[PDB]
Amino acid sequence: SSVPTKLEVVAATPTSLLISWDAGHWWEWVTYYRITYGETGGNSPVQEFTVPGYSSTATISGLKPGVDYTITVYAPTSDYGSPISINYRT
Amino acid sequence: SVPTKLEVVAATPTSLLISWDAGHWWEWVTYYRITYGETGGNSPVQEFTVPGYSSTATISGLKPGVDYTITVYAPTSDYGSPISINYRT
Amino acid sequence: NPYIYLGGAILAEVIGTTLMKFSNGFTRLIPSMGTIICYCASFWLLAQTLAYIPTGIAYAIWSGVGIVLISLLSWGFFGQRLDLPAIIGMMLICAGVLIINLL
Amino acid sequence: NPYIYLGGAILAEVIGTTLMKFSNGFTRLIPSMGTIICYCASFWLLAQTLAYIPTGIAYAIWSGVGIVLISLLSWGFFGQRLDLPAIIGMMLICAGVLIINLL
């Protein structure tokens, strides 16, 4: 019973990934989602960027092919719910 | 009052790098609009806008040998009359 | 006629303030959009009124009716009263506003 | 703590309105930027100080200290002194603030 839901990879690419999620109901829409992505066998930090809260899709570029990555989508605060995180191998 | 001293720094047969005195801090405007067209006018002219903190602007896509008229307008006519000059590439 | 645009700008700002309590620090989309729209509406109405109605009169009616409206909406959504000594101190400030405005 | 951020939003707003009077039709860059930063800060400051203090309670202290600092900064060094027998009304506003401030 939280935001967001259904974190899935729409389109893939050896260097890029297009992802989306269920932003929830209109009262559940936030003003900004921050997205965090990095190597799943983390040796180094997690690149994060924010995106306006009226969009449910986001594109990530500059990935190294063959490497498995972790992608997590957060909320402005922890009050909306726990962030959703998935894995994908480019 | 502003802008002031509109002159063409660099000049290529197809491009003109112009500059002006943007004023001085507490008299900086939000934006200037720069109009450049043929000195006679075949049918239209050309024009763009530049943020207020900038004092220079480049004008590309011109024809060699043609004399152009370049005018710079303040956001409103309250700052003074727009300054206009001429140049032949 | 301009007194009607004033009260509308008052109500618009009242609605904007009540919608801001719903925005959770501008972190909920739609309440945050509602506050921006309501304040832009009160901006446009107030600018149309100031061309006719004097400024000191506009603020006096604004602060008075505004204090009443958002206090009654703060009480109608998440009610409270004299959390600290005085509700009469609220209208006491309102009276202190009305003097240095009209007088 | 919450009344500190309320007074900070009051100060940020007053600075924004004064910079708007100095700026022309939102055309002078630096003061117009200042107004935007100030209104951005004030609205974010008031939003985060609204969850602690009641809305109508915050509305009064907001309007009160505002015009206090407005007439103060006006008479301060950008002219003005008019309606002089009304500083009592400023003391009224401060009185209404105190009976609602941490007492």
Residue numbers in the entry:
A (entry chain C): 3 to 92
B (entry chain D): 4 to 92
C (entry chain A), D (entry chain B): 2 to 104
Paper text:
Proteins from the bacterial small multidrug resistance (SMR) family are proton-coupled exporters of diverse antiseptics and antimicrobials, including polyaromatic cations and quaternary ammonium compounds. Representatives of the ‘Gdx’ (guanidinium export) subtype export a bacterial metabolite, guanidinium ion (Gdm+), in exchange for two protons. Representatives of the ‘Qac’ (quaternary ammonium compound) subtype are proton-coupled exchangers of quaternary ammoniums and other hydrophobic, cationic compounds. The overall fold and many of the binding site sidechains are shared between EmrE and Gdx-Clo, yet the two proteins have markedly different substrate selectivity profiles.
